[PDB]
Amino acid sequence: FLKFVILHAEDDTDEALRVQNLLQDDFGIKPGIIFAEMPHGRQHLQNLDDAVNGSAWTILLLTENFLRDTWCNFQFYTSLMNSVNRQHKYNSVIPMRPLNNPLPRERTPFALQTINALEEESRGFPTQVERIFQESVYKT
């Protein structure tokens, strides 16, 4: 049971590695994995479920590639899960804008605008990260 899984469009795998290294090395949040490192071959629809159920948090690397390639599948997955069980996924979902090619706010889909995102450009980001990944939340 990992702490975080970074969902990321295939073309952003370099940024997903960088954010993983940032969280693991600079903030000590371990262990963590990137969606690209997940069992390959395994169908996308499912290994999404394996990823989201496999970690205490899931991080959305918000980019225009992510919006084009991966958002609709995840919104459909989460909304379907939320419609059939009480473990409503978004309480564990963290949208993040990275330093490189972030998805603008005015292009972020409204469902994710309901969540206080993580902005890597913000000087509050270290404090936000500390708030989210506090160890007392890592339960079950």
Swiss-Prot record:
GO terms for cellular component: cell projection; early endosome; early endosome membrane; endoplasmic reticulum; endosome; endosome membrane; Golgi apparatus; late endosome. The keyword Phosphoprotein applies. Keywords: Cell membrane, Cell projection, Cytoplasm, Endoplasmic reticulum, Endosome, Golgi apparatus, Immunity, Inflammatory response, Innate immunity, Lipoprotein, Membrane, Myristate, Phosphoprotein. Expressed in spleen, prostate, testis, uterus, small intestine, colon, peripheral blood leukocytes, heart, placenta, lung, liver, skeletal muscle, and pancreas Isoform 2 is ubiquitously expressed (at lower levels than isoform 1). It comes from the Eukaryota. One of its GO terms (molecular function) is molecular adaptor activity. GO terms for biological process: cellular response to lipopolysaccharide; inflammatory response; innate immune response; negative regulation of chemokine (C-C motif) ligand 5 production; negative regulation of toll-like receptor 4 signaling pathway; phagocytosis; positive regulation of canonical NF-kappaB signal transduction; positive regulation of chemokine (C-C motif) ligand 5 production. Changing Y77F: No effect on phosphorylation. Residues 1-140 form the TIR domain. Functions as a sorting adapter in different signaling pathways to facilitate downstream signaling leading to type I interferon induction. In TLR4 signaling, physically bridges TLR4 and TICAM1 and functionally transmits signal to TICAM1 in early endosomes after endocytosis of TLR4. In TLR2 signaling, physically bridges TLR2 and MYD88 and is required for the TLR2-dependent movement of MYD88 to endosomes following ligand engagement. Involved in IL-18 signaling and is proposed to function as a sorting adapter for MYD88 in IL-18 signaling during adaptive immune response. The TIR domain mediates the interaction with TRAF6 and MYD88. Homodimer. Interacts with TLR4, TICAM1, IRF3 and IRF7 in response to LPS. Interacts with IL1R1, IL1RAP, IRAK2, IRAK3 and TRAF6. Interacts with protein kinase-inactive mutants of IRAK1 and IRAK4. Isoform 1 interacts with isoform 2; the interaction occurs in late endosomes and disrupts the interaction between isoform 1 and TICAM1. Interacts with MYD88; the interaction decreases after IL-18 stimulation in a time-dependent manner. Interacts with IL18R1 and IL18RAP. Interacts with TLR2. Interacts with RAB11FIP2. This is TIR domain-containing adapter molecule 2. It comes from Homo sapiens (Human). The chain holds residues 78 to 217 of 235 of the full protein.
